[PDB]
């Protein structure tokens, strides 16, 4: 089981490199088109990829300029853009502007008016003078602009075989829900194909099935006689199910974890040399005390995250995941001075100061030193075991 | 006291999550309106949230453009803004421009002229040519523009019950006190409501009172027989007083510290397993030597902060809190290269260099290694105690 | 062999300082001219040195403006620039615009039209209305603008001797290969000279040859009797071959590694004091166990890099090298919060979260503490050896 | 010597806080005026405080616009600025434009034409068409604009006593020495006063003289009987000489180091408690082995800095101080990913990668772990000494 397992290492590594490079190319085309949509249909989109909202409006005239800008850029799409884009399909072409507003109270009704491309390319501003583009900013909820663009890929034609098509369904929104003098703008784009070797994969399937059967022979041998082979069977299952989902993302996660446990199994096969045996036994003998200490430090960590979220929430810290990520950065060095910079509030400032000093001092000293003291004890006991 | 205490954990955690999310929403509305005031009333406010001053003027024409801009945006507030804003109340509407200047010497007198909206709403601009808007930049101290805006929240009406109102009291200032060719601009905004379940909280009060009485029964039992229960009583007091201030911020700090000690008490109840007992006894036995070493390192740290403040103050470092935060970042790795970048001054440069090298080398090596050597000694003595 | 070896230290250090300062000056001139080409020939080049592409176009009108801008700036080069630049040589002056496009399919033919400077300096801009500057953005591959500029250096004339000349061969490209609505712009510049003491280096050659012969006498003495002298002979070879390539970059790498091993040999000659002997024996006795543990941690590290590349590739991570660099930063603390910021995708987000926490916790704790436990064991065994 | 020494602590701390705050205010006025000069006299100075050069010109028209801009802003200084500035004194008012250029070769002659303010305030701009403002960018070396501005401080009049004046001597330069198509712009400003309690300091002098005499009594007592008192006498000398230079910066460095050793002496007086005695004896017993190991690691560090400077110099790294600061950041975690980002060059790229990995791995592991192993050994030997 030397060549059959090294062949697993090499074949699953090649499968993951080819598959990851394929999805790299495809998602590069996806985000290239959505950035090249944000530069066309959003007014004043600077190129600084700002946030999940691409920009935000603070006045009641840039709203009209952005709406009329999106409609005029959609009308002159053929001149303006420089991809291979063209109008698609409500089973019709042209825009569809839905706006939402309160009933003069409680109900959010919507008024959605469709705009065909013959209405736009007649070219008097007749749609621009209708009452539908009169907006009551006292009671506007949102304005959504939606349309459908098809785009041929030609990087596939570049140095490879011909056929590929796409279809984009864009939705430009004007999110005014926190009625607080700020409209955010989104561009939610989709993409899905239409018209206009499995040998390596089944090969990896056969390799992982044979390794699974032979490792279960080893498992039942160890059962009748009486866990790295558990991880080898796990890697078998993850590669086979990842190959099923690759055949008919989740499959990316399956192949990624499978190759991670593949290289951990290589770290097992380094253990024939006895120095790697010393290191592996150090990790195996020290792991549960580390898990218990990580659990206790995690409970103290939760106490600090709830305290920092319900105090320094307004002064930084919005979600608990953001607070947990920032405090895990603060323990590990980075983002340290930025937290002291974002805090000005006199008593709350003093609380923030001794909070951060107590947190950093306590966790770094009495947690990193304790994790060193666990591993040093385990390593010297294993040195005494080999003496 | 298992269910009564785990009910405290979960119940005070739910109280803090609900209360923190409520204040998150309210302060999100507050800062959304003050950013949407800075974008309306400050000329050339780029959206880069620059400092506590939002921008700064370096000439004597952008001053006039910013003042006249603030007045004209206040006049066209109904067209310009896109919240639900409206003019409020000097018991009157309209602006109130107070400017301060030296007596041709010693006295800073002020000249404050009020501007009603009927004066602005005249078709000719006649306020712009009074002598009050002639400024002597030899002797101008500050110019303050103040007004009052009311704004209905409608995110409360969004998917919840209706009633909410506000009243903002803005104060645009032109701070020229360091008479040094630089006017800073502020927008100091306020907010306070006007017109146009306590079951969970009293439930937490009852839980914490019952736990307080029963833990005092445990305290007097330990007294008559002869400190985690001290922290449990502390958590009782902090949740009860936080519930009082929530009933009739400080209450945020009370609830945050209370939940922090709540999860520390959970870390106590992890101690029934003996590995957590080993870790907790390691921390308890090693804490006072760590405190004495932190005190001595803090005195050396104060020596370095006073030296770096009175030397590298001009070349970076303004307040002692800023110097202490930057040096606490420098010990923990972050902001390391930025301090070497901000320093050019030949002998003072050499002093800065060996200052930073001596500081980082001395504290990181002979303090982090000493904190490891304390904890390793304590952990091996406790291992010998359990052997 | 005291003076002959310290003379090697100081002499090769002086050689490297002089040679590195010479190449510093020359490459400073090179990048100064290529930045001053990007500011002249690229439209809207902000001065923010953006990427290997200097800027990118997202519309089909800034393409025409950038092409016509590059041609007009080349025509007015004598007025526009402020170096000593002049037109050079296709064996002719003037531009040469080659554009590439698909055959209406499969073939990428090219159409390359040359533009002499007398054609540019006509009173009408009649080249701007030829059909060659009609572009089909459905099928355009790239547009390349190329020309040749000569430029005299005068910093050489500044405070030194006279003669120096250059010749630049610029190539402005409009890279539209990912046919995805985005043209990137490059400026690929070249430089090569034309017309218009070796005593120190041969001295280093003689020093290193004498030290090489005498250290081989020491080697054959140790052979007939039965490895720092190996590193001294290595430093001899690297300085001699670096002096050969300096006589007739690679020579930069040779001299850099040679001086690195020069100062490592100085660290050897610190070993006459016995404290440095303790430290050097600690490193020598602890090195192979460190190498085996680094190998095992490197295999686990490869598992994490393949997993993070094939999962968090779309959400960050393009090449495997970039993933390895970012994870080596994450272990050492830097770029910690930036990885949590660039991730939003719900299940993939959860996977990213426990991926990063498991990675940081496992490697920092059970690798840094294990490396400390190796060195502490080796140092105490060497302390027992000296007791 | 308890009260006499604690009085030294408190009085020298108050002296340093008052003196540092005084110089903070004065240098705040200095840099406020030089930023408010860069915003007036430099064209397009964005407010991004870019470098020691405030901006840089890449064309031959922004040169003329910046020169003519500086002259016109100097002419309209009274309208443009908003400090209390006024024209000062060549013993005359007005500008003095010196330009330097090559002799058609070798000699850099200069042509310096003075401009009185009456020449500027003529009804035509007849100075703008003299031949002196014709520039040969083939052979221009630099253009320098110089003038003298006086400015009254009024922050001194704000809430304090009256008298203060200043005089600024600005020098706007157009540095074209690397004749490489890039003019840098400087604004070198000066400042010096003209016309228009020592009780605390002599008190600290008396305290430090009395402590110096009494500590020399302790020194001669220890001499006749047979070093913290050495540091106390050092602090005496540094405070006295700093008070001399404060009476009649260097004095900032003297007072900063004196207060640093003051708080180190406080760390000595913490040693009456025996835990601080343990920590202080740990540092004192472990210091020389740490110094020898720091020396050996510094020699290896010099090897890496010379190698990285003569290789990665062109691809990052200009001065050896910059390389040493960046590598000291790389050891301490910070600036880690930025060094991998700034490197693209295939073999040199591979050299950069294994350079950085070998550097970080070798120094962090086999230096930080060795520094921990020194301190742990010293601390356990001192624990055995107290057992």
Can you walk through the features of this model?
The structure is a homotetramer of 387-residue chains. The first copy, chain A, has 387 residues and is of the alpha+beta class. The first copy, chain A, is 58% helix and 12% strand. Chain A has three domains: 3-23 and 197-272, no CATH class; 42-188, no CATH class; 275-385. The first copy, chain A, has eleven helices and seven strands. In chain A, strands 1, 2, 3, 4, 5, 6 and 7 form a seven-stranded antiparallel β-sheet that branches. Chains in contact: A-B, A-C, A-D, B-C, B-D, C-D. Chains C and D meet through helix 1, helix 7, helix 8, helix 9 and helix 11 of C and helix 8, helix 10 and helix 11 of D.
Instruction: Sketch the major β-sheet of chain A.
Output: 7 strands, antiparallel
Query: What general form of chain A does the structure show?
Result: flat
Roughly how many Å is the radius of gyration of chain A? Answer: 30 Å
Number of domains of chain A: 3
Which two chains form the greatest contact, residue counts included? C-D, 77 and 69 residues
Compressed to H and E, one letter per element, the order of chain A equals: HEHHEEEHEEEHHHHHHH
GO molecular function (chains A, B, C, D): calcium channel activity; identical protein binding; iron ion transmembrane transporter activity
Protein name (chains A, B, C, D): Mucolipin-2
Transmembrane segments (chains A, B, C, D): 2-22, 197-216, 229-248, 250-270, 293-313, 350-371
Cytoplasmic side (chains A, B, C, D): 271-292
């Amino acid at each position: 089981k030397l060549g059959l397992q090294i062949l697993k290492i090499v074949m699953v590594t090649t499968q993951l490199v080819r598959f990851g490079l394929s999805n790299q190319l495809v998602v590069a085309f996806k985000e290239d088109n959505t950035v090249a949509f944000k530069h066309l249909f959003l007014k004043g989109f600077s190129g600084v990829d700002e946030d999940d909202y691409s920009c935000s409006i603070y006045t009641q005239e840039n709203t009209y300029e952005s709406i009329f800008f999106a409609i005029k850029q959609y009308r002159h799409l053929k001149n303006i853009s420089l991809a291979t884009l063209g109008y698609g399909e409500d089973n019709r072409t042209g825009l569809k502007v839905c706006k939402q507003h309160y009933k003069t109270d409680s109900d959010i009704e919507t008024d959605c008016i469709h705009l065909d491309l013959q209405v736009l390319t007649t070219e008097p501003e007749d749609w621009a003078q209708t009452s539908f583009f009169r907006l009551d900013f006292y009671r506007l909820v949102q304005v959504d602009i939606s349309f459908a663009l098809k785009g041929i890929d030609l990087q596939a034609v570049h140095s490879r075989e011909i056929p590929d098509c796409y279809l984009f369904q864009n939705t430009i929104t004007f999110d005014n829900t926190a009625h607080s003098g700020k409209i955010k703008i989104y561009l939610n784009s989709e993409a899905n194909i239409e018209e206009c070797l499995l040998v390596f994969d089944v090969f990896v399937i056969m390799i992982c099935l044979a390794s699974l059967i032979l490792c279960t022979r080893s498992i039942v041998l160890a059962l009748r006689l009486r866990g790295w082979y558990v991880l080898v069977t796990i890697s078998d299952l993850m590669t086979i199910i990842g190959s099923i989902l690759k055949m008919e993302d989740v499959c990316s996660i399956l192949l990624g974890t499978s190759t991670l446990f593949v290289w951990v199994g290589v770290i097992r096969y380094l253990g024939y040399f006895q120095t790697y045996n010393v290191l592996i036994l150090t990790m195996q003998a020290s792991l549960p005390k580390v898990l218990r200490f990580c659990a206790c430090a995690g409970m103290i960590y939760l106490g600090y995250t709830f305290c920092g979220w319900i105090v320094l929430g307004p002064y930084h810290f919005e979600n608990l995941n953001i607070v947990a990520e920032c405090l895990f950065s603060l323990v590990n060095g980075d983002d340290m001075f930025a937290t002291f910079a974002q805090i000005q509030s006199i008593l709350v400032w003093l609380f923030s100061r001794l909070y951060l000093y107590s947190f950093i001092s306590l966790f770094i000293y009495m947690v990193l030193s304790l994790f060193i003291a666990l591993i040093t004890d385990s390593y010297h006991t294993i040195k005494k075991y080999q003496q």
